[PDB]
Amino acid sequence: MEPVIIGALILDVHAKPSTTPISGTTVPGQVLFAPGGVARNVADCIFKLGITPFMIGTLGLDGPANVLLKEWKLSMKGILRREDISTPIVSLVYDTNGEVAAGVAGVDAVENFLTPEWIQRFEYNISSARLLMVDANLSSLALEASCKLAAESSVPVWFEPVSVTKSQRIASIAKYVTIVSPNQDELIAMANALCAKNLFHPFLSIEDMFRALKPAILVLLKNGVKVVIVTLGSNGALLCSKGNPKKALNFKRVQSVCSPNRFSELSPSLFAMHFPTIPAKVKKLTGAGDCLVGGTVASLSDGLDLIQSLAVGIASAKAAVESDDNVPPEFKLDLISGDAELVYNGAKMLMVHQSM
Amino acid sequence: MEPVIIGALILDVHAKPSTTPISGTTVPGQVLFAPGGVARNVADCIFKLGITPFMIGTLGLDGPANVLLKEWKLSMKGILRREDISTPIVSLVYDTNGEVAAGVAGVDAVENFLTPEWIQRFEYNISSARLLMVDANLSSLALEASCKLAAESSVPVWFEPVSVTKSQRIASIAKYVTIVSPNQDELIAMANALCAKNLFHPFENKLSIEDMFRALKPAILVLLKNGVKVVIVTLGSNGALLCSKGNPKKALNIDSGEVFKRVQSVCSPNRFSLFAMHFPTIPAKVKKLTGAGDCLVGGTVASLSDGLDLIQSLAVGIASAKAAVESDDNVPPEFKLDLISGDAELVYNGAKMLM
Numbered sequence: 256m257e258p259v260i261i262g263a264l265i266l267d268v269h270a271k272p273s274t275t276p277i278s279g280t281t282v283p284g285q286v287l288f289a290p291g292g293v294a295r296n297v298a299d300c301i302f303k304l305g306i307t308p309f310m311i312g313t314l315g316l317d318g319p320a321n322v323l324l325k326e327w328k329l330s331m332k333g334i335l336r337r338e339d340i341s342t343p344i345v346s347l348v349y350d351t352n353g354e355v356a357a358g359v360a361g362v363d364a365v366e367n368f369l370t371p372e373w374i375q376r377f378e379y380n381i382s383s384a385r386l387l388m389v390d391a392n393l394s395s396l397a398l399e400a401s402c403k404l405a406a407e408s409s410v411p412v413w414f415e416p417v418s419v420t421k422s423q424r425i426a427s428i429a430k431y432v433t434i435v436s437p438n439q440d441e442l443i444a445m446a447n448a449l450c451a452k453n454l455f456h457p458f459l460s461i462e463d464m465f466r467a468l469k470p471a472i473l474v475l476l477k478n479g480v481k482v483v484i485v486t487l488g489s490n491g492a493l494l495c496s497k498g499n500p501k502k503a504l505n506f507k508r509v510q511s512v513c514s515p516n517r518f519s520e521l522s523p524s525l526f527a528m529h530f531p532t533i534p535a536k537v538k539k540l541t542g543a544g545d546c547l548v549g550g551t552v553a554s555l556s557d558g559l560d561l562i563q564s565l566a567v568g569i570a571s572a573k574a575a576v577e578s579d580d581n582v583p584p585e586f587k588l589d590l591i592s593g594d595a596e597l598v599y600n601g602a603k604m605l606m607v608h609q610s611m
Numbered sequence: 612m613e614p615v616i617i618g619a620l621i622l623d624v625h626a627k628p629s630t631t632p633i634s635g636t637t638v639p640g641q642v643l644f645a646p647g648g649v650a651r652n653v654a655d656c657i658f659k660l661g662i663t664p665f666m667i668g669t670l671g672l673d674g675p676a677n678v679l680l681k682e683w684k685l686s687m688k689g690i691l692r693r694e695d696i697s698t699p700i701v702s703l704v705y706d707t708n709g710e711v712a713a714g715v716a717g718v719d720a721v722e723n724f725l726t727p728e729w730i731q732r733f734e735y736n737i738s739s740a741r742l743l744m745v746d747a748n749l750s751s752l753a754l755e756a757s758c759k760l761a762a763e764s765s766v767p768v769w770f771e772p773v774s775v776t777k778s779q780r781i782a783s784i785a786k787y788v789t790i791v792s793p794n795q796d797e798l799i800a801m802a803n804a805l806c807a808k809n810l811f812h813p814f815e816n817k818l819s820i821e822d823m824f825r826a827l828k829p830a831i832l833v834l835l836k837n838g839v840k841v842v843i844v845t846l847g848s849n850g851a852l853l854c855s856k857g858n859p860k861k862a863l864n865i866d867s868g869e870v871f872k873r874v875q876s877v878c879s880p881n882r883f884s885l886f887a888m889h890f891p892t893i894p895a896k897v898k899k900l901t902g903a904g905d906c907l908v909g910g911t912v913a914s915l916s917d918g919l920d921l922i923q924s925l926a927v928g929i930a931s932a933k934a935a936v937e938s939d940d941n942v943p944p945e946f947k948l949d950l951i952s953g954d955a956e957l958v959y960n961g962a963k964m965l966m
């Protein structure tokens with residue numbers, strides 16, 4: 256009952272300059288191709304963790320597609336290929352700290368050609384999935400078709416918001432969505448989408464960040480999202496759920512060491528925990544959030560609970576920021592396990608002194 | 612006796628935003644791949660004009676190489692490929708006015724892996740070449756090795772200056788070079804490199820052709836007195852200056868396609884020691900200036916390779932450059948030879964003596 260992953264397959268061009276980029280000219284640096292796209296990365300990540308996902312997406316019959324498919328070891332049955340399709344390309348120029356200085360995304364093939372008509376061919380895979388992961392590169396209509404199919408079979412849906420603009424596609428599907436994984440800005444954009452107004456604004460301690468984000472988080476939850484995971488970069492992640500997180504969504508290494516009886520307080524309408532990350536040496540930050548999703552989905556797919564699974568996701572994200580690839584060539588399970596335990600044992604409840 | 616082309620194979624990545632580029636994330640837009648590198652472009656251009664060149668360069672066994680070689684239909688014999696080589700890429704992200712907002716060039720493989728040793732494997736091809744074209748992405752040692760092999764077999768050498776910085780690599784090979792094709796900026800840089808002092812200064816409005824020539828003449832003279840025989844100064848929409856030691860109607864000493872016959876029937880060889888000529892260009896609707904200087908070289912080299920004289924040949928090069936600026940690619944997917952011929956005629960007939 257494999258997890259089904261639906262969304263963008265993208266050829267990333269990553270330009271890491273040796274010094275500070277300057278308008279009007281080129282600086283020397285390192286320019287690389289990396290297999291990318293949120294859905295492709297998530298599927299890649301899940302597979303490298305020992306779980307087989309089913310990928311649904313679209314590619315051209317062009318050079319970038321060949322690069323993307325060169326080492327592809329999963330089924331391609333879900334991949335729409337047509338000659339009138341241009342394989343999506345993202346070009347990033349980084350700053351010397353590893354943050355994106357300037358970027359252009361050309362991903363219109365996903366919005367235009369990854370259609371309900373293509374996706375509905377796979378109603379069996381979706382309705383029988385352990386979980387459905389959709390990214391926001393899909394058009395609203397594709398998103399609706401996907402999420403309704405999962406929903407009618409009570410298959411939990413993970414919505415990956417992709418960007419501040421695309422995250423707003425939550426608006427027409429929130430009731431069908433079980434889990435979302437925005438960063439701070441995407442969370443605010445999503446809240447504003449669901450409010451149909453620009454009521455919350457973008458942007459220090461964890462309690463402070465949480466107090467700032469809480470109203471926005473509540474907006475998503477009462478619009479039907481059951482779990483909000485707010486990724487905070489080097490500050491880790493927040494896990495907020497409607498109801499107890501263990502029965503809200505509703506490996507052998509991790510399960511033995513990240514005890515499902517560590518946390519006493521495990522049903523409130525807003526449950527909130529902070530997960531720290533682990534000090535890393537960054538080669539490239541791109542693809543960390545995607546590996547957080549991959550690692551979490553893989554663990555959930557193997558029967559771990561959401562607190563354990565997120566710990567694994569955060570371990571996987573750490574491994575990713577230390578690679579030039581979006582997803583590391585390989586994961587080492589002793590490292591992932593070790594890191595997951597650290598994150599997990601370091602995780603804390605928020606709203607401890609509050610009671611509302 | 613194929614013309615031999617040595618230098619960069621580069622994947623150009625052009626990122627065109629739809630709106631405002633933002634820190635930390637992507638703006639939507641269009642990203643285009645264009646096969647690039649001065650030498651690869653020249654070889655591409657020559658081939659599309661009906662002449663087969665021999666290309667010497669270096670590529671990785673990676674993704675960018677796959678994209679680059681997807682439509683390459685020429686021999687790969689001269690291309691050094693290894694698994695530890697990262698294929699050159701220049702990545703440009705534009706702003707909405709059309710200027711480079713941020714750009715990164717990763718092209719060090721040319722200098723590090725296109726060595727004199729690799730080049731000497733093709734001494735036979737070079738010594739028998741009708742013409743040798745080198746670009747300045749080559750290391751100085753690679754440049755010296757190439758040009759010495761050509762000189763010893765009296766093969767004409769065309770040096771493409773590539774950029775203001777790399778143009779200065781002319782200094783250790785000037786005596787070996789027959790033809791150079793700098794723009795204004797590259798010309799000054801090259802003259803400064805060759806002089807015992809930096810007497811020339813950079814670039815202020817545009818200005819008339821006779822005046823531009825007068826301003827540039829001293830820098831041009833520095834190149835000639837250092838052994839360069841022909842200086843082609845490219846001037847963008849103002850065409851090109853052609854300055855030579857001895858009269859400009861020079862042909863390759865070779866004992867022929869349909870570029871030759873179209874053009875010669877139409878660009879009459881009886882229309883026409885420092886000689887200077889101005890060649891006008893032809894109004895185009897620019898979609899991208901990409902590839903213009905390279906197709907000028909490509910077109911001229913192709914015409915010389917088919918037996919045309921330098922004057923006829925430069926006229927074709929200017930026609931070819933015009934076609935390049937009307938393409939998104941560095942080199943148009945195709946040339947239409949009657950059109951190239953028609954444009955070359957205008958240029959040829961519009962060209963005038965300055966000195």
Ligand SMILES: Nc1ncnc2c1ncn2[C@@H]1O[C@H](COP(=O)(O)OP(=O)(O)OP(=O)(O)O)[C@@H](O)[C@H]1O
Nearest residue numbers: 438486487488491532535540541542543544545572
């Ligand atoms: N510098 C870092 N050190 C350790 N872990 C990190 C670091 N940066 C990110 N991570 C891990 O990656 C996760 C997601 O990071 P972030 O919130 O920056 O991703 P994003 O904003 O979705 O963008 P992307 O996924 O492209 O990185 C974080 O929750 C964290 O666990």
Ligand SMILES: Nc1ncnc2c1ncn2[C@@H]1O[C@H](COP(=O)(O)OP(=O)(O)OP(=O)(O)O)[C@@H](O)[C@H]1O
Nearest residue numbers: 794845846847848850851892893895903904932933
């Ligand atoms: N707008 C145009 N219309 C017609 N011909 C053009 C135009 N722009 C350039 N050309 C032709 O291209 C030739 C080269 O132009 P330019 O001198 O700008 O090249 P460059 O400075 O070497 O830049 P690049 O290497 O990017 O081509 C010119 O001599 C001209 O004949």
Ligand SMILES: [Mg+2]
Nearest residue numbers: 417438544545
């Ligand atoms: Mg993300």
Ligand SMILES: [Mg+2]
Nearest residue numbers: 436438486544
């Ligand atoms: Mg995220």
Ligand SMILES: [Mg+2]
Nearest residue numbers: 792793794904
């Ligand atoms: Mg030039």
Ligand SMILES: [Mg+2]
Nearest residue numbers: 773794904905
């Ligand atoms: Mg040039």
Ligand code: NA
Nearest residue numbers: 539575578580
């Ligand atoms: Na990475």
Ligand code: NA
Nearest residue numbers: 901935938940
């Ligand atoms: Na062009």
